[PDB]
Amino acid sequence: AMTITNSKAEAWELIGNQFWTIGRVAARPSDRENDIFLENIVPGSTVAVIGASTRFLIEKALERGASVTVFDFSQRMCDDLAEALADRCVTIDLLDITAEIPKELAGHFDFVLNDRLINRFTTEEARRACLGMLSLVGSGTVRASVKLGFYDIDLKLIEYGEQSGTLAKFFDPSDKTFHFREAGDVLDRALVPHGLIDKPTLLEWYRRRGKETRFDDEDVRALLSHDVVNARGYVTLEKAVELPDAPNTMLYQFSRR
Numbered sequence: 001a002m003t004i005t006n007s008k009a010e011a012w013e014l015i016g017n018q019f020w021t022i023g024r025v026a027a028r029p030s031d032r033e034n035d036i037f038l039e040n041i042v043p044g045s046t047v048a049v050i051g052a053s054t055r056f057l058i059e060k061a062l063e064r065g066a067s068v069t070v071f072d073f074s075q076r077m078c079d080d081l082a083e084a085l086a087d088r089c090v091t092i093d094l095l096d097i098t099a100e101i102p103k104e105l106a107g108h109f110d111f112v113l114n115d116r117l118i119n120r121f122t123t124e125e126a127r128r129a130c131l132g133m134l135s136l137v138g139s140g141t142v143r144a145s146v147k148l149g150f151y152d153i154d155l156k157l158i159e160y161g162e163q164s165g166t167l168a169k170f171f172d173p174s175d176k177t178f179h180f181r182e183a184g185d186v187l188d189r190a191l192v193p194h195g196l197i198d199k200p201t202l203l204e205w206y207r208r209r210g211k212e213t214r215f216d217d218e219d220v221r222a223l224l225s226h227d228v229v230n231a232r233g234y235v236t237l238e239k240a241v242e243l244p245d246a247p248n249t250m251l252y253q254f255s256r257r
């Protein structure tokens with residue numbers, strides 16, 4: 001019942017294992033990218049993955065010898081993941097990274113990884129999230145990739161919502177936040193192929209997904225330097241790398257010590 005405080009979790013009850021079985025292939029890290037997420041991580045390391053959907057990244061983490069805990073705010077996601085890994089030794093917990101971290105977990109991980117999870121946030125949600133990741137790692141490293149600029153669907157959203165003159169109703173240009181459930185009829189028209197998941201399932205997933213903010217590189221930097229994220233010590237961006245396969249996707253490694 002943390003789905004009361006965060007109704008976005010409802011969006012992922014809809015999807016479950018479909019995300020990595022029939023979802024858009026490019027919407028998860030490639031083999032190479034799993035490897036980049038994991039560099040200099042060695043057997044024995046404690047690693048937290050936020051997003052139980054990143055099933056193959058989690059599986060390379062375990063194969064590498066790391067002690068992996070997965071966090072996700074959706075019960076089905078946890079359940080389908082625990083099913084796919086029933087033979088492996090791994091901890092899977094129900095948690096909302098934008099909620100305040102349980103004290104029993106502060107500074108408990110060497111690494112916190114997530115792939116394009118920040119894209120599932122609004123700006124104030126993403127600020128809270130980054131704080132949570134930092135809270136988890138204590139003096140460890142956070143590696144978080146972010147997809148930059150607009151999604152293909154965004155381009156249909158602008159177009160088909162301009163012609164309709166509804167664009168301002170569901171898109172805020174101040175920080176580039178979309179409200180999908182509020183484009184109404186435009187959403188249906190703009191939907192693009194996400195692997196082999198069908199239109200009814202997409203539409204609903206989008207509608208349940210709430211608001212989402214789009215980021216440019218300057219936007220991710222502004223987020224990381226924001227007072228809310230530095231409220232408990234100052235943050236350091238150690239590096240930022242443009243990923244090979246994924247779509248204009250920058251991976252950011254940061255910490256606060």
Ligand SMILES: C[S@@+](CC[C@H](N)C(=O)[O-])C[C@H]1O[C@@H](n2cnc3c(N)ncnc32)[C@H](O)[C@@H]1O
Nearest residue numbers: 012028051052053054072073096097115116117
């Ligand atoms: C990893 S992110 C998006 C990128 C894509 N799913 C991937 O694996 O590359 C989506 C996953 O994170 C989870 N998630 C989204 N928002 C969350 C939040 N606020 N707290 C915890 N988990 C969240 C969702 O349940 C979903 O499993």
